[PDB]
């Protein structure tokens, strides 16, 4: 149905938004 997060569980819909909410308030290994 939806595209959930690998950090938190935080959802939008797609990857498409979803990859930018990761860069910044997971930032991978920054
Ligand atoms: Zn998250």
Same mark, same amino acid.
């Given at each position: 149905?939806?595209? !959930? =997060? !690998?950090? =938190?569980?935080?959802?939008?819909?797609?990857?498409?938004?979803?990859?930018?909410?990761?860069?910044?308030?997971?930032?991978?290994?920054?």
């Amino acid at each position: 149905k939806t595209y !959930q =997060c !690998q950090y =938190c569980e935080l959802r939008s819909a797609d990857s498409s938004n979803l990859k930018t909410h990761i860069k910044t308030k997971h930032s991978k290994e920054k």
